[PDB]
Enzyme design. Structure first.
Site, PDB file in Angstrom:
ATOM      1  N   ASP A  51       0.019  -7.596   1.825  1.00 42.35           N
ATOM      2  CA  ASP A  51       0.491  -6.201   1.846  1.00 42.35           C
ATOM      3  C   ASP A  51       2.014  -6.141   1.978  1.00 42.35           C
ATOM      4  OD1 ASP A  51       0.529  -3.448   1.817  1.00 42.35           O
ATOM      5  OD2 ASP A  51      -0.366  -3.177   3.809  1.00 42.35           O
TER       6      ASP A  51
ATOM      7  N   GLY B 278       1.779   6.850   8.454  1.00 42.04           N
ATOM      8  CA  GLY B 278       3.172   7.286   8.345  1.00 42.04           C
ATOM      9  C   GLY B 278       4.178   6.221   8.772  1.00 42.04           C
TER      10      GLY B 278
ATOM     11  N   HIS C  56       0.820  -1.234   0.000  1.00 41.42           N
ATOM     12  CA  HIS C  56       0.000   0.000   0.000  1.00 41.42           C
ATOM     13  C   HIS C  56       0.850   1.280   0.000  1.00 41.42           C
ATOM     14  CE1 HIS C  56       0.135   0.155   4.519  1.00 41.42           C
ATOM     15  NE2 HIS C  56       0.021   1.454   4.281  1.00 41.42           N
TER      16      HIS C  56
ATOM     17  N   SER D  59       3.512   3.127   8.114  1.00 47.39           N
ATOM     18  CA  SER D  59       3.193   2.120   7.094  1.00 47.39           C
ATOM     19  C   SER D  59       4.443   1.645   6.400  1.00 47.39           C
ATOM     20  CB  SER D  59       2.292   2.743   6.020  1.00 47.39           C
ATOM     21  OG  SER D  59       0.998   2.950   6.528  1.00 47.39           O
ATOM     22  N   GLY D  60       4.555   0.332   6.223  1.00 40.60           N
ATOM     23  CA  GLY D  60       5.673  -0.250   5.491  1.00 40.60           C
ATOM     24  C   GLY D  60       6.889  -0.535   6.354  1.00 40.60           C
TER      25      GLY D  60
HETATM   26  N1  LIG Z   1      -3.195   1.322  14.050  1.00 42.10           N
HETATM   27  C1  LIG Z   1      -2.265   0.942  13.179  1.00 42.10           C
HETATM   28  N2  LIG Z   1      -1.360   0.141  13.571  1.00 42.10           N
HETATM   29  C2  LIG Z   1      -2.286   1.465  11.760  1.00 42.10           C
HETATM   30  C3  LIG Z   1      -3.441   2.064  11.243  1.00 42.10           C
HETATM   31  C4  LIG Z   1      -3.446   2.546   9.931  1.00 42.10           C
HETATM   32  C5  LIG Z   1      -2.305   2.443   9.127  1.00 42.10           C
HETATM   33  C6  LIG Z   1      -2.321   2.962   7.732  1.00 42.10           C
HETATM   34  N3  LIG Z   1      -2.911   4.059   7.515  1.00 42.10           N
HETATM   35  N4  LIG Z   1      -3.006   4.649   6.324  1.00 42.10           N
HETATM   36  C7  LIG Z   1      -3.976   5.560   6.105  1.00 42.10           C
HETATM   37  O1  LIG Z   1      -4.864   5.769   6.932  1.00 42.10           O
HETATM   38  C8  LIG Z   1      -3.993   6.345   4.813  1.00 42.10           C
HETATM   39  C9  LIG Z   1      -3.339   5.866   3.674  1.00 42.10           C
HETATM   40  C10 LIG Z   1      -3.378   6.623   2.498  1.00 42.10           C
HETATM   41  C11 LIG Z   1      -4.071   7.838   2.482  1.00 42.10           C
HETATM   42  N5  LIG Z   1      -4.698   8.280   3.587  1.00 42.10           N
HETATM   43  C12 LIG Z   1      -4.672   7.569   4.731  1.00 42.10           C
HETATM   44  C13 LIG Z   1      -1.149   1.846   9.642  1.00 42.10           C
HETATM   45  C14 LIG Z   1      -1.147   1.360  10.950  1.00 42.10           C
END
Ligand SMILES: N=C(N)c1ccc(/C=N/NC(=O)c2cccnc2)cc1
Ligand SMILES: [Ca+2]
Length: 223
Positions: free
Chosen positions: A84, A175, A40, A177-178
């Protein structure tokens, strides 16, 4: 990372920042030429930033290297986030040293109860929004598959696991993410998704890296 701590500069030497004019995702360096991230996180024009602590200040240990190719998992589903995972190849090999180092792939899956280190430059608030400049860290246990499925009915596949705290207050976030989930020196997870961040009974959900080791190795071997 919500409810975490300041890692300390270059204490997480496999942590990378993916930059497209700004930090947008984390990743994990797995050898001199390859990074593992979330599918993603895919976009074109990625520059991989290694050796980062403060992502807004050049502090002296950085290596900035453009991606030459990205390979999203063949079975990635962006609706369910199943599979993912993405590989990114660097245009040139990173210079590996104490502050820029690869993380080992697992040879077996980790079990519920294993403590892991989760890290990134994502949001530090569960309600509002505040983005750190320096790398943040969270120590968290892997949760049982049953508790993970109970938290997210109908959403947890065999390629996902939960880690964190059902009480809330401590989690990865947007943020992050990944980025890595490292347990006993192995990359076991990738920051994938969750409902909000650090919410009660909504722990972080992570890509189960041990399922992909064969794919990672063969992909690297031919690309
Ligand atoms: N709680 C966690 N561990 C968690 C939750 C969410 C995410 C990922 N989010 N990405 C987004 O919302 C997003 C992505 C693209 C555009 N606008 C918003 C990671 C961890
Ligand atoms: Ca920096």
């Amino acid at each position: 990372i919500v409810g975490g701590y300041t890692c300390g500069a270059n204490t997480v030497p496999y942590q990378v920042s993916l930059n497209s004019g700004y930090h947008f995702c984390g990743g994990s360096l797995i050898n001199s030429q390859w990074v593992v991230s979330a599918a993603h996180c895919y976009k074109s024009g990625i520059q991989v930033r290694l050796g980062e602590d403060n992502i807004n200040v050049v502090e002296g240990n950085e290596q900035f290297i453009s991606a030459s190719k990205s390979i999203v998992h063949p079975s990635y589903n962006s609706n369910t986030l199943n599979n993912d995972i993405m590989l990114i190849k660097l245009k040139s090999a990173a210079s590996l040293n104490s502050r820029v180092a690869s993380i080992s792939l697992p040879t077996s899956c980790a079990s519920a109860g294993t403590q892991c280190l989760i890290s990134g430059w994502g949001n530090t608030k569960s309600s509002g929004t505040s983005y750190p400049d320096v790398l943040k860290c969270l120590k968290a246990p892997i949760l049982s598959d049953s508790s993970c499925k109970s938290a997210y009915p109908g959403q947890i596949t065999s390629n996902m696991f939960c880690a964190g705290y059902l009480e809330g207050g401590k989690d990865s976030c947007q943020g992050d993410s990944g980025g890595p989930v490292v347990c006993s020196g192995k990359l076991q997870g990738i920051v994938s998704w969750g409902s909000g961040c650090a919410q009660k009974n909504k722990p972080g959900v992570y890509t189960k890296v041990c399922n992909y080791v064969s794919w990672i190795k063969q992909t690297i071997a031919s690309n």
